[PDB]
Amino acid sequence: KRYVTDRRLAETLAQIYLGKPSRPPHLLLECNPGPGILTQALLEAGAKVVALESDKTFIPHLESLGKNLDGKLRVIHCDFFKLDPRSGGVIKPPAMSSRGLFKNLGIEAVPWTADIPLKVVGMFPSRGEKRALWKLAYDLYSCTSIYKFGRIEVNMFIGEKEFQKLMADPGNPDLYHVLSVIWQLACEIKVLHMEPWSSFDIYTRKGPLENPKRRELLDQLQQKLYLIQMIPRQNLFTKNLTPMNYNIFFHLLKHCFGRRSATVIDHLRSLTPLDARDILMQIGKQEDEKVVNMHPQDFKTLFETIERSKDCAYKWLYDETLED
Amino acid sequence: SSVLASSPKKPVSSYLRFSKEQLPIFKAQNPDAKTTELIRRIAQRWRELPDSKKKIYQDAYRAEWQVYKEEISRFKEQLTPSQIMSLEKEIMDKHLKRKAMTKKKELTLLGKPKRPRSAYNVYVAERFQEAKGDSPQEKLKTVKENWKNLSDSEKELYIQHAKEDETRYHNEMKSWEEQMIEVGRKDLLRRT
Amino acid sequence: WAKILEKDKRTQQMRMQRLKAKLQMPFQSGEFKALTRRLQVEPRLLSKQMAGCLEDCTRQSPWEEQLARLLQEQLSGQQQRLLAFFKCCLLTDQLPLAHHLLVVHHGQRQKRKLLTLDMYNAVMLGWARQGAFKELVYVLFMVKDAGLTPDLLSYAAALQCMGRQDQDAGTIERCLEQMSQEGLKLQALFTAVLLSEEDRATVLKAVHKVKPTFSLPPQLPPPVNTSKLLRDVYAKDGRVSYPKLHLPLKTLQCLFEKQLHMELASRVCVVSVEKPTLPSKEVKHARKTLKTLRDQWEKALCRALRETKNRLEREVYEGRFSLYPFLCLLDEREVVRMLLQVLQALPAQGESFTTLARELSARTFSRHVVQRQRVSGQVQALQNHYRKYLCLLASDAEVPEPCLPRQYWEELGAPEALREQPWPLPVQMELGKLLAEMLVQATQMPCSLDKPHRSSRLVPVLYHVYSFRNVQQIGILKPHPAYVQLLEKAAEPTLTFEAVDVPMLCPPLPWTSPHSGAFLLSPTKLMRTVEGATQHQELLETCPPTALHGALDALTQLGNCAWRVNGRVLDLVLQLFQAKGCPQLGVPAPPSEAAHCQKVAREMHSLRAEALYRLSLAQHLRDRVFWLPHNMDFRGRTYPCPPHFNHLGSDVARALLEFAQGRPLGPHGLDWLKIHLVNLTGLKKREPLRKRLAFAEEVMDDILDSADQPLTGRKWWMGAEEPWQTLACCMEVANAVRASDPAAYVSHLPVHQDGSCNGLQHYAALGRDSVGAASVNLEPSDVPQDVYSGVAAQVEVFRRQDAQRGMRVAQVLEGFITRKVVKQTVMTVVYGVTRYGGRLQIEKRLRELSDFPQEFVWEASHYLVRQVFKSLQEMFSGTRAIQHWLTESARLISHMGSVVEWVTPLGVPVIQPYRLDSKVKQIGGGIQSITYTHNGDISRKPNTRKQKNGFPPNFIHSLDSSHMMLTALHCYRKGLTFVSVHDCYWTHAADVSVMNQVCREQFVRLHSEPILQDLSRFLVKRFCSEPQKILEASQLKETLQAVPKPGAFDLEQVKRSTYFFS
DNA sequence: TGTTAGTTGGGGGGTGACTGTTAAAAGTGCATACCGCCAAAAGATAGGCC
DNA sequence: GGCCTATCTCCCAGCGGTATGCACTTTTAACAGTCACCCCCCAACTAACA
């Protein structure tokens, strides 16, 4: 898919991800090393590499080129995608479970309120980025799967088209979406470095791409890739927004953006059997506002102000029957 | 200040520019003639005018249309969104008001009978002129005080007059209802 | 006050002067239309001569003579709606509204182009029914001004108009010589015109005045068919013993009255099959909460209904289409009762908008048809025809000569019951959407159910919530949880059925025509077809009526059968169902059970709802005889119209139904029942009949303890493959054994005769394949032969010949092959199947075993599907050739825009409803916009994947239907009651041998005809021999004439085979 | 039981209808494309449509 | 070649919101002299609606 063949970006990215290298816990988890020049670059800078290479080929090369040094590759056949399989998982050589990757390294578990335990770097897939963000978001809000332990840092690369919709504000009317609310609410995001398409080498399953026409055709688009750093906010999970009731909030965001050119009054009438004016002047806003004119924080404000009215038992009008 | 009053003036039509030019001349020549006849004669003279001179006069209308387009573009650029919302609200209120007077004149022209006046209203109508006070409000208060001071024996004639007025209103309402049923005005029929 | 009165009086006088000036002002002016409402009658015509007569021949009886003088001279959605508007304004007496819309659409230019000739002719007939000359003249002025030439029905309306309002004028039917000049004959006026009989009577009154020597053509008796297969049943000089029902005239007459009242009420209520709920204070609170149950919403629905009709009327006057006559067809009471009954039985999970609209529109149409038939006086005609018809097929009555019910129904005077075609799909969609919106907005309830003093707010009863799956969403009407709590809180009588869903009580209406049959007044189509598609009915009516005759008679034979409920069987089912149900043996447990738990609850509730409906219908129909109508599908197979209690159901259903009329057993009686019970055990399949009978005699103690004490016994009947039918058959044989003379016992129990793998049987008959004719039992042999075990034993040869080398085959396949893993693919080879799906099937079969290495599932599935397809190719040779030829023909006909078409040997033609997804159509509205797909569009291209996959299974099912129909018609003559599930034939226990004899005989007679050759000739005459293109004539003519050559098999030997259909 | 309302006679004043002839901005109805990816393993098997 | 899918019928079920363009009729106003009409103040009753 996407691999690097330039030493300049290798050294620059090694200095960027270096930061403070004093990490007595587990240090690096590269999503897909490939050729592995980034691995030797990180070993050169004083950082360990744990190659989670998805492809079954090039597995022994990293360990044969890395076991002799004090910094150890410890190559494990897995991927940073395709983990914790549900309704399955009896046999899995490409994919592999969650606890197996951590009993082989000895992280065990820490609470959510602790410091940053690990650091995971790599790529998003070329297509299906939204599915990956949805799987990561469900793992984040469920406090299960990978994020069962304390926290994580999941610095990756993301495309510009999805970066524009990854975070948005009140305003930006064309691009304000549900994931824009979810990803700002869950983690704080900082941008670190900018990259072109032409620097990356296009790669296939059999080997590197040998067609100049194909790589020139893909480079003529020149999508500006973006290094993004998710860090989870310490007090995301609260008494109102619990990790067992998040799917109702996901329903609220999906329905409230279902009719985009509308008002909060109508959606709240369709959703809750409560007077929506009471909630709207309880949080401090007025009646005639439009849904493309609210903060991401205002959604959590509305959602958390709904629940504490314990006088009325029927409050949400959403069940598992709506999942279909 | 009114937002609609601050808008630039609309482009003057060539026919109406000619009519405005010839209106004082026709008013001075024919002071005793009605304005409707003068406007009809001016329009007849405009019909006698060939369309080529209309096009030559409308070239200036095109130029002033470009000037008005520039002016309204500058005005729209100078308008805040709050001023735009206020102007839209004023336009909607003016349209609703215009529809209200249109419906009121339509209901009045059809010959709907008035509501039956009470005996107090009959006394006010009869004795408003013979009331103390120069102001009409003082006359109304004096007549109301006189009605309060009246006895039932003197009020019996006004009650009988109100009864006759109610009977006349009932007859006119029945005739009006029959005429609307003849044309099928079911919305104008009273529910009770 | 005096001068005020004077000035108001003067102003009033000027107001009436202005009003009179407005009356003198023409209605074409916008001001006079806006200020005063009126409907316009005088037409406006955009021509000089027509305006000249407008002034002249309205300033003026010349208008009487103009009526005769003028006689001398792909539809879009709006067009369909306008035509339906005018046809609905015919039936209700609102002709001025139709005239208003017609003249308004004639006034404007764009709306003129929408109007067609039938739109004029409808209102022409409507004004002709009242006999007004001048308005007929006005409409004919409109017709001649628009350039449309008048038609025969248009002249019929004129002659009917001169016929009524008798003036004894000389010029009645004036200038009929002009009708001769244009070329129209007077005999075509009486026949083949859709006007009613009273119109024929009045036009007959009009026609005799000029020409006294004018008589109707003499009628003739209906012709009989001379086809080869249908000759013997419809033939003379034959001795026939026709069957007759057991119960007398009085019972039939009382049940006809009961069914008429059932259908006129259009709804039935069913007592609760579950346990009663214990009374309490909350029970009384929910029982007395009927103040808000209908009374707070029936008035709201009346208000909304009247306001909607007034709004739609003032939109009618302003030159637009409306649903005003479509909502004024039915009275307020029943159209509110529709919403009240639909609002019942609402689940917590709700339903979609489109489903509710589709339900409401059809529910309105059914009541419209039955009420219109009530008003017009056809109910009494039906009664007085049915009383004389029922003299036939009555035990206490006789006939001059015996004949079928259809021929006797035609021999009596024609009932002449004609019913109107249903509305097009857009009008149904809009009316259902409007009713759903009125329901969701009119019904609102106070949310303070628990405590009235807590709050006073009005919340909706049904919420519009979106349900998201994948990318898509859907609108869902979700009830408020308080109403759900109230509904499932205290009491559940909660049962209400329609009149169509419940089975009948009187003999069904004979299928005289594709329009009339099945239910007496309620409408039922002859072919089950998705909504909007109507090519089946056009093909069924275009054909000659004689060709369908026997087919319709077959359906009538399937409708006269009488059914009863076995109370002894469902006593135990009720005993298990009311208490904690055991999920074993099919009875559902309640979802109380005391992620995946929600799925279990959903499935259990979904099964228990159908359990409630079926068992409640069982208890209500207890100790009462019920008879079932049948209809025919898209291909030709038959199913009962009621979907709840069809005998084409599970196993608990077939445990209850039992014949009413009885036959005595006699010599060969109990042997067939014993073989049947061994067949229903399933333990001893592969033995001849003598060993099955010996086994039945061996297990008599088991049978008696399974029958005499069924509940809490030795529990033998649970181990069978079909438990409840086994228990019923063991009950019958235990009762039949304990008799003084077992030959004279009266039998009410049907006996299954079934053909194993009937599709391969028909394929082997068509291809004359000698090798396959033994695998399926089409050859005389002493032992039965199954194809499943043959395949599972033939793959072992390949297994050993491969694993002698010792690959991974010996790990699994030399250990684990059996006929339980190859049963599904040999079941489904007759239908569509491929290697992918078959691989999935055997993958599941291989992973089903607990003692099996799971690491080798994947390659073993590949190897096993390859060997199974190789074995099936080796066993059956002509079957694959026929399937390939049929697929090639369907592909070559679907490349062009031609849906595949064929004609059965019994005369029924078949089409296929496969076309690409059309331009979907959305209805703009207030609460929600909904979309649908219109199936009636012929413009959309064929789907060449759903036709090539689908022609070969449909042809075989057509042949199956033909064979069943032939053996039904030939069992009727000899006095045998025939009931068919598809490839499952039932008669009484006494007469199974005669069924088997005529079954083999009709199989040989059907397959003796060259079915493939006549199909090739029909598909060469149709769909070929055209100059349209050259590639069609190059490819189709070569491919369709090539047919698989037959083998060497003597077909007459099927007459001596003991295991075909056994 | 709680809520609107029209004249009753003056009095100040903007404003629609009566007279107008001719081009011209805008609402209505219809159709169509884009988004709406709320997720969930592949181990590879053909074969015909595009 | 690049790509998509997978088993016939009956039963049940079968997607919405939003921006832009096309064809066309309907106001409409371009502006102005003149005449009653209505908005509102001075307080009320019964007719009507809810």
Side-chain angles (χ1 to χ4, degrees), chain C residues 75-142:
Chain C
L75 269 77
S76 52
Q78 198 74 225
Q79 284 174 358
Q80 299 182 5
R81 267 175 302 184
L82 261 294
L83 186 48
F85 190 79
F86 286 126
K87 296 217 41 54
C88 187
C89 286
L90 288 181
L91 299 162
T92 303
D93 52 353
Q94 301 159 309
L95 264 297
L97 273 74
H99 197 67
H100 185 185
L101 259 65
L102 201 70
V103 79
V104 162
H105 280 51
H106 192 82
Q108 316 185 4
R109 184 176 67 85
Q110 286 84 20
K111 298 161 175 181
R112 182 182 295 172
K113 279 179 190 178
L114 284 180
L115 269 44
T116 67
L117 190 34
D118 288 359
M119 249 169 281
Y120 303 93
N121 305 136
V123 73
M124 232 170 306
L125 163 68
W127 278 128
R129 289 199 194 123
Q130 273 152 3
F133 282 162
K134 68 184 318 292
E135 302 174 356
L136 263 298
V137 174
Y138 284 167
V139 174
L140 260 204
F141 263 48
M142 262 179 230

Side-chain angles (χ1 to χ4, degrees), chain C residues 109-110 352 355 358 466 473-475 528 635 828 831-834 841 914 928-929 945 949:
Chain C
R109 184 176 67 85
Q110 286 84 20
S352 182
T355 301
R358 280 178 207 241
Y466 283 76
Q473 48 191 11
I474 190 167
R528 290 178 204 236
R635 285 94 57 86
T828 203
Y831 304 152
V833 78
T834 36
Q841 300 196 117
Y914 304 124
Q928 186 184 2
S929 86
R945 204 209 212 146
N949 316 338

Side-chain angles (χ1 to χ4, degrees), chain C residues 792-851:
Chain C
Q794 192 178 2
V795 289
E796 168 70 13
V797 166
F798 305 116
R799 254 74 191 181
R800 53 185 50 180
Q801 201 171 0
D802 281 304
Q804 275 172 300
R805 282 90 172 93
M807 319 72 98
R808 303 318 299 177
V809 169
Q811 164 59 62
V812 172
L813 289 322
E814 276 293 59
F816 303 93
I817 64 183
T818 181
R819 67 141 278 181
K820 220 53 41 179
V821 309
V822 281
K823 186 195 206 182
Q824 267 325 119
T825 185
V826 178
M827 251 172 203
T828 203
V829 48
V830 289
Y831 304 152
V833 78
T834 36
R835 299 177 68 249
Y836 174 82
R839 179 206 91 74
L840 260 62
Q841 300 196 117
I842 42 184
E843 177 182 0
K844 166 141 91 153
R845 290 296 82 179
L846 263 294
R847 75 181 303 241
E848 194 271 331
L849 299 100
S850 61
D851 171 335

Side-chain angles (χ1 to χ4, degrees), chain B residues 10-13 16 20 23 27 35-36 98 104 108 120-121 137 140 144 166 190-192:
Chain B
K10 277 280 191 163
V12 179
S13 174
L16 284 187
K20 186 183 176 187
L23 171 72
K27 193 178 181 185
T35 316
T36 57
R98 168 193 177 182
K104 182 161 188 166
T108 314
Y120 166 63
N121 294 125
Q137 299 87 0
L140 183 82
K144 177 204 177 188
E166 193 168 0
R190 295 187 294 184
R191 301 183 180 181
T192 62

Side-chain angles (χ1 to χ4, degrees), chain C residues 708-728:
Chain C
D708 193 52
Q709 295 179 357
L711 180 72
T712 71
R714 285 214 308 111
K715 286 217 267 322
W716 184 62
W717 61 270
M718 281 145 188
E721 215 162 64
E722 302 292 328
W724 284 106
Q725 321 195 260
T726 313
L727 181 132

